[PDB]
């Protein structure tokens, strides 16, 4: 009998690996003629059709809490954002001593005391003459020097004005593994993020993942199938957030009704500052709307699943955040270029014991923006003319459990902004990268000639 | 009768020049912190590099035509400049200063070496100014004609070195890429040129610390058996005479002042660290070196210089000839502060066939490192008392005089060129490219 | 009975687009001229071109669909910016000026063309300012309302051209990567399109000077035999006609003004070069060209324009149909001075079937190259008088009007696009991709 080693090259065997996946965007998007911070133009074009191959009899182990595709997406998103603001105007000369007064013309009772009317001396295009100008600033952007104000960022760092020729609207981008690697896609409907995946497939690029930046509420994301899924790294912990994914989307309208005007202030050769002119009409508050019927059931679906982890006879509560800075204690996003900070204390409320209404969520606005929890890298968002309104649907939540001990009768979950990579971890939970290892050796009855 | 047989993989090499890449000990310095010649971005070095000794192969080395030196120079400079790119630029500091002498408990030796200046500067808000003051060393300021200005304002605006990045010389290992090799010379008495009977090949060079100094090689590799005199042409006066010690010489250097640092806000997120005030007595910096230890070391140097200049020659050491401070003094770095010590107490003797020598040392904060023009750097002050205990392992000498008649050779320290500082570490290395194709006759023939 | 057999390395190619790299001789590099067309970036060129003539081959070219022109355009612009990256930005020059006419010796022709302006200015020290003056041409100052300002201040600040660098064109060869080839058409009567019976292949193109000009192609390559007329759609009035003379017409350019350079320090390590005062009399800068050699050349151009428009047509010339200064005039560069000569005296004739003609020329220093906006450059004034002589080796013409089918054709000068200056040099070359695999039938089957 006997056997001799036989060498096979090209065998289907792979091992987990980490590498650099390259982007892939739709070709037609380039014809929009306007660039976006995500640099879809510099990103590779996508293939005309998707190529996916189903793999029978194969079981693989996934882990969404140690996936490295998220850590690369986090760096790419930060890197793209910075590169877009490198060539834009730097608002150092705006760190001067302002003189402000309240606006009261057609001021709504709720909104009184939020918008300031500030005036300051500024240089003109000529380096000798100076001009007296004014601009409206929200109260969250200015502080008093201890009637006399200053921008909040001056004692921390200067900000680069956002170029009005670049957009913030998400543009779907696919992550493609280069040659010698592959991406495995868990096709299971009830996958909970870790463990075996009975169904798997290989694809050349991931689906279109929109880099939506949001807090406490995952918008415009992907919806689950046949149920609501609760996904936590260690469900019986308290410092690990919970990534609920909604089965059925819930719509949330939001608006900034003010009919404000833009105004260009030239502060140097070829560089201009886009200030805010006087408003047109009444001064009101920004807000989003949520149908109370769909939100009342959508928490009805969520509570039932949570009963499968913490108890079948526990009293599930909800509460209004934990407290802290607006960037974590509110639902933040940008709608049209204006950055909202909505107080969602009314969505999470009431306790669970075992048709034409709405829930209005007041929202603040801001212009001096720190995006990625970084210190000294602010940005200034220019104002947008005309009322801006956006309609989107929520598709998840980022909750946190307070961890009560010896009184397990009730578990209270509060929304949590967590880290920004949890926002994208909810879209890459199906994917993992594997490195192909073509060389293999097995025994057979063959031998070499001569 | 015989046919051409081609072999692929033969051990043949030829001298070549390519690009080597860095590699640091990595795990040896865990909890790493940022610094120039970035420890990160260097491929981590293997825990046990494999050195292979080649049996009876003789290679002709040359340390003065070496290209690893030229690439290291352009490489150390590049790492230096790319670290100053993000730090503060002190344009606002090029203003009119009003300085008065420092006399608060000052010693006669340091009577007027540091001034006390007040100047106007803007604050975070551009429309308001602040009046600030700082202590400046007299070497950094020039009178305008009580009104002084920083010495660099009419040449360039200096960048303030970031305080979070250190100047500590972390060791570096230069590695040759695939298809190349690095030949080490194992001979104890190899004078830097000519055949080296003992040869070996390594993946990367040993740990080389880029210690920038002058006329004294600090923290260097020692000669294994004897003091070695190395020069390109010993009979040439215009060639610096490198010297290597077989025994280190401790040099204790310190700054005995208790300086305080003060932060002045000159813009959004920008601070210029002024020298707040000196707490206590004001005394000059200095280095110490044992008189008996050094006088022994110079004895060996003469014992070997005689081999090249004869038995009977009288050999006198003398202090540097002259020039600018950057070249005529033992300039170096100690803890981030830049010293310039007057070495006239070391090189002072005439040689015929417990007590510590103290060298007065000066300080500066406007530094021009690589002899360039217009790229000054401002080293922020360091709070406390500075001290370094490095030990000496070489010299950079020069000679002069003599034309058709001589009986007593005089040597002086010198050398401001920095590639002479790393030429002392890479004298036992060279890079070659492997050539695997070889054709030799054999009796075999192809079948068809 | 036949089977498939594969051949590797067959001579087959197909049209393609790739990145071509520049290669120049080291004459400018060895002496450190530092031309803006960086030869430091470009690789060393081969000692002598190697051209292979491909007999029996027919190839179809198209000079208008050639992509080498669109890749050279981006190369030239990019090399331009990289040279201006370190040069000082003239942001402090945007102040209110106070100008008065110069009349010391100004001749009536140039009366009012330059002004004597004075202004506050910065200094090395941040707390002081200086009062200085400089002569600015009339085209580079707009009355602000005896108070003017630089014309660019409301759009962008200009970087002053590093005086050390040079604008003089130097040949740059475009070389094909591995697996690609360049095919040169050698047919003399080749009209820039269609099959070219005779072809060769070269590794790199001939030296092409990136000469920037308008309405007249200078220092170019001359045709052979007869004058060649080339247009994309010669029956379209929207397409420019790229003439190419077979003999070079010589043009002499100069500015007699003996202006002086003056350096003003506007900050730490930075300087601004003012225009000083002019020694002697101030007069106009002109360009000469023989009226006899220019008359015969149009006689040779007209008999070729006849073949494409008829023998009985009255061929008439006119001057540019108005517009901007940069397009209505023959704008070029020589000696660092940007001329904008008025060519209305060259194109004025009617053809129905020693002496010189002088062209007044203006000068300006705020320059917006490549038809870009907001990226101006300031050209420093040059010492002394400037003179230069050059070929005239082609034109850029345009028709106008459609009143009649064919009665009278008037051809005006053009130059609205900068690529046409380079389409007249690369019209001979096309880049191809080599596909070495090839399968054909043969009587051969694998044994065993």
């Amino acid at each position, epitope marked *: 009998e006997n056997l001799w080693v036989t060498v096979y090259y090209g065998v289907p065997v792979w091992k987990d690996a980490e590498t650099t996946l390259f982007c892939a965007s739709d070709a037609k998007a380039y014809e929009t003629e306007k660039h976006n911070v995500w640099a879809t133009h510099a990103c590779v074009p996508t293939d005309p059709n998707p190529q996916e191959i189903h793999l029978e009899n194969v079981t693989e182990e996934f882990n969404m809490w140690k996936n490295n595709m998220v850590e690369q997406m986090h760096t790419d998103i930060i890197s793209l954002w910075d590169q877009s603001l490198k060539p834009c105007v730097k608002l150092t000369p705006l760190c001067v001593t302002l003189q402000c007064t309240n606006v009261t013309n057609n001021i709504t009772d709720d909104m009184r005391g939020e918008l300031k009317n500030c005036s300051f001396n500024m240089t003109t295009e000529l380096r000798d003459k100076k001009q007296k100008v004014y601009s409206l600033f929200y109260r969250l952007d200015v502080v008093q020097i201890n009637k006399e104000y200053r921008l909040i960022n001056c004692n921390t760092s200067a900000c680069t004005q956002a170029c009005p020729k670049v957009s913030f609207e998400p543009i779907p981008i696919h992550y493609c593994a280069p040659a010698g690697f592959a991406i495995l896609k868990c096709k299971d409907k009830k996958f909970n993020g870790t463990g075996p995946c009975p169904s798997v497939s290989t694809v050349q690029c991931t689906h279109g993942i929109k880099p939506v930046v949001s807090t406490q509420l995952l918008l415009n994301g992907s919806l689950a199938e046949e149920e609501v899924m609760i996904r936590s790294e260690n469900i019986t912990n308290n410092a690990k957030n919970i990534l609920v994914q909604f089965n059925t989307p819930v719509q949330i309208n939001c608006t900034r009704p003010n009919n404000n005007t833009r105004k260009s202030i030239r502060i140097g050769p070829g560089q201009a500052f886009y200030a805010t002119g006087d408003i047109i009409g009444d001064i009101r508050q920004a807000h989003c709307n949520v149908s109370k019927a769909t939100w009342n059931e959508t928490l009805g679906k969520v509570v039932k699943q949570l009963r499968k982890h913490f108890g079948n006879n526990t009293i599930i509560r909800f509460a209004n955040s934990s407290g802290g800075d607006l960037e974590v204690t509110t639902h933040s996003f940008n709608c049209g270029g204006e950055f909202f900070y909505c107080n969602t204390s009314g969505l999470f409320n009431s306790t669970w014991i075992s048709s034409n209404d709405s829930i209005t969520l007041p929202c603040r606005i801001k212009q001096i923006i720190n995006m990625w929890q970084r210190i000294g890298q602010c940005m200034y968002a220019p104002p947008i003319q005309g009322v801006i309104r956006c309609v989107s649907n929520i598709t998840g939540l980022i909750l946190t459990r307070d961890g009560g001990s010896t009184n397990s009768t009730t578990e209270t979950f509060r929304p949590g902004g967590g880290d920004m990579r949890d926002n994208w971890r909810s879209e890459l939970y199906k994917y993992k990268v594997v490195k192909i290892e073509p060389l293999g050796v097995a025994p057979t009855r063959c031998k070499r000639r001569v | 009768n015989l046919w051409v047989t081609v072999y692929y993989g033969v051990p043949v090499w030829k001298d070549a020049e390519t690009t080597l890449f860095c590699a640091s000990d990595a795990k040896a310095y865990e909890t790493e912190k940022h610094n120039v010649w970035a420890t990160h971005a260097c491929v981590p070095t293997d825990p046990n590099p494999q050195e292979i000794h080649l049996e009876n192969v003789t290679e002709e080395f040359n340390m003065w035509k070496n290209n690893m030196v030229e690439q290291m120079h352009t490489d150390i400079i590049s790492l230096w400049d790319q670290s100053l790119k993000p730090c503060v630029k002190l344009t606002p500091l090029c203003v009119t200063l009003q300085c008065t002498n420092v006399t608060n408990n000052i010693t006669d030796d340091m009577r007027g070496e540091l001034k006390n200046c007040s100047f106007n500067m803007t604050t975070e808000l*551009r429309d308001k100014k602040q009046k600030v003051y700082s202590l400046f060393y007299r070497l950094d300021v020039v009178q305008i004609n009580k009104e002084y200005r920083l010495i660099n304002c009419n040449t360039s605006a200096c960048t303030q070195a970031c305080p979070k990045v250190s100047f500590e010389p972390i060791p570096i290992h230069y590695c040759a890429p695939a298809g190349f090799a690095i030949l080490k010379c194992k001979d104890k008495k190899f004078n830097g040129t000519g055949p080296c009977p003992s040869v070996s090949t390594v993946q990367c060079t040993h740990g080389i610390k880029p210690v920038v100094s002058t006329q004294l090689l600090l923290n260097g590799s020692l000669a294994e058996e004897e003091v070695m005199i190395r020069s390109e042409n010993i009979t040439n006066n215009a060639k610096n005479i490198l010297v290597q010690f077989n025994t280190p010489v401790q040099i204790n250097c310190t700054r005995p002042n208790n300086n305080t640092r003060k932060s002045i806000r000159i813009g959004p997120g920008q601070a210029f660290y002024a020298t707040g005030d000196i707490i206590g007595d004001i005394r000059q910096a200095h280095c110490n070196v044992s008189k008996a230890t050094w006088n022994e070391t110079l004895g060996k140097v003469v014992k070997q210089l005689r081999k090249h200049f004869g038995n009977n020659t009288i050999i006198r050491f003398a202090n540097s000839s002259g020039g600018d401070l950057e070249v005529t003094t033992h300039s170096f770095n100690c803890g981030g502060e830049f010293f310039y010590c007057n070495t006239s107490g070391l090189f002072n003797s005439t040689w015929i066939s417990n007590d510590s020598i103290t060298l007065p040392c000066r300080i500066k904060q406007i530094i021009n490192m690589w002899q360039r023009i217009g790229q000054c750097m401002y080293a922020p002050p360091i709070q406390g008392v500075i001290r370094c205990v490095s030990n000496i392992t070489g010299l950079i000498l020069t000679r002069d005089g003599g034309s058709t008649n001589s009986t007593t050779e005089t040597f002086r320290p010198g050398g401001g060129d920095m590639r002479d500082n790393w030429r002392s570490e890479l004298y036992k290395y060279k890079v070659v490219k492997i050539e695997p194709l070889g054709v030799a006759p054999t009796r075999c023939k192809r079948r068809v | 009975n036949l089977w498939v057999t594969v051949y590797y390395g067959v001579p087959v190619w197909k049209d393609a687009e790739t990145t071509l790299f520049c290669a120049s001789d080291a004459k400018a590099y060895e002496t450190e001229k530092h031309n803006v067309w960086a030869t430091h970036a470009c690789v060393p060129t081969d000692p002598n071109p190697q051209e292979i003539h491909l007999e029996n081959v027919t190839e179809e070219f198209n000079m208008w669909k050639n992509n080498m022109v669109e890749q050279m355009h981006t190369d030239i612009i990019s090399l331009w910016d990289q040279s201006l990256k370190p040069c000082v930005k003239l942001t402090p020059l945007c102040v209110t000026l106070q100008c008065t006419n110069v009349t010391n010796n100004i001749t009536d022709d140039m009366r009012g063309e330059l002004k004597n302006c004075s202004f506050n200015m910065t200094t090395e020290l941040r707390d002081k300012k200086q009062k200085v003056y400089s002569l600015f041409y009339r085209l580079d100052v707009v009355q602000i309302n005896k108070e003017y300002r630089l014309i660019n201040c409301n759009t962008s600040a200009c970087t002053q051209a590093c005086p050390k660098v040079s604008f003089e064109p130097i040949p740059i060869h475009y070389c094909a990567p591995a697996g690609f080839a360049i095919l040169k058409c050698k047919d003399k009567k080749f009209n820039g399109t269609g099959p070219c019976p005779s072809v060769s292949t070269v590794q790199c193109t001939h030296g092409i000077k990136p000469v920037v000009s308008t309405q007249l192609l200078l220092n170019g390559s001359l045709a052979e035999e007869e004058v060649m007329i080339r247009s994309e759609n010669i029956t379209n009035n929207a397409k420019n006609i790229l003439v190419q003379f077979n003999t070079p017409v010589q043009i002499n350019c100069t500015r007699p003004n003996n202006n002086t350079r003056k350096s003003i320090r506007i900050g730490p390590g930075q300087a601004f070069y003012a225009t000083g005062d002019i020694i002697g009399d101030i007069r106009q800068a002109h360009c000469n060209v023989s009226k006899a050699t220019w008359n015969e050349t149009l006689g040779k151009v007209v008999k070729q324009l006849r073949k494409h428009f008829g023998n009985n047509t009255i061929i008439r010339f006119a001057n540019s149909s108005g517009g901007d200064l940069e397009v209505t005039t023959h704008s070029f560069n020589c000696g660092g001075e940007f001329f904008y000569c008025n060519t209305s005296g060259l194109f004025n004739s009617t053809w129905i079937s020693n002496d010189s003609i002088t062209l007044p020329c203006r000068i300006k220093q705020i320059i917006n190259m490549w038809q870009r906006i907001g990226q101006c450059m300031y050209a420093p004034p040059i010492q002394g008088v400037i003179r230069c002589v050059s070929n005239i080796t082609g034109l850029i013409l345009t028709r106008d009007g459609g009143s009649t089918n064919s009665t009278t054709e008037t051809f005006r000068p053009g130059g609205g696009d900068m690529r046409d200056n380079w389409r007249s040099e690369l019209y001979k070359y096309k880049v191809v991709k080599i596909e070495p695999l090839g399968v054909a039938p043969t009587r051969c089957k694998r044994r065993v």
Partner: antibody
Amino acid sequence: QVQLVQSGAEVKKPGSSVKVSCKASGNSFSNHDVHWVRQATGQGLEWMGWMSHEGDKTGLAQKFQGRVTITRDSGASTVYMELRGLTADDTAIYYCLTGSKHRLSDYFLYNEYGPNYEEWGDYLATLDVWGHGTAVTVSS
Amino acid sequence: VVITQSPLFLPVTPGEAASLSCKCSHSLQHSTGANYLAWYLQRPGQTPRLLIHLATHRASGVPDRFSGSGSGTDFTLKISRVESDDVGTYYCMQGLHSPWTFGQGTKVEIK
């Protein structure tokens, strides 16, 4: 021509205050400055104070610091000087007049980003036009 | 800051000449050296008239017979071709140092 008008004379008891009123032709106070001087029988001229024509500056001598304040109406059509703390020695004749000043740059400090810092110093050139002259007396 | 004048009295006859002096507290080397000095002449029942400003310029309508000079802490004024109307008191006012002040006064009378 620029000309000034003032109010009539008054008499007050010690410790009271007098607020004089002054007017000018053509609203010259919008283009030139205003200064105040008084003089008594056998006594020399005594500079009191002034106000800039832009309104940026209003200076008075230490002799009348706190005891005097100056204000003017809209359009610079009328200007008032108020003296409080009247005493017997204050009996004199007060004059309304206009003077010219030199505005010079005293200290400069450049800025890349923002308006360059500057400090301006006023200097008294001349007194141009005097007013009618108002007599104020303090008596029991 | 203080100012003084001399002589205190000047008995003059028509056709004669007279000279006056003025003092400045500080040798302030600024504003063209001679800096800002103002002279005035007053008579009883009449508002004073400006005579010299900037220490060297003749006021509008003033005959050329009046001139002044000085610098630093001292200043001087001169008169010539005296006539009857020249009687009165002359004041020198310092316009540089804030607060500004008049002078003691120098009287001129017929002789």
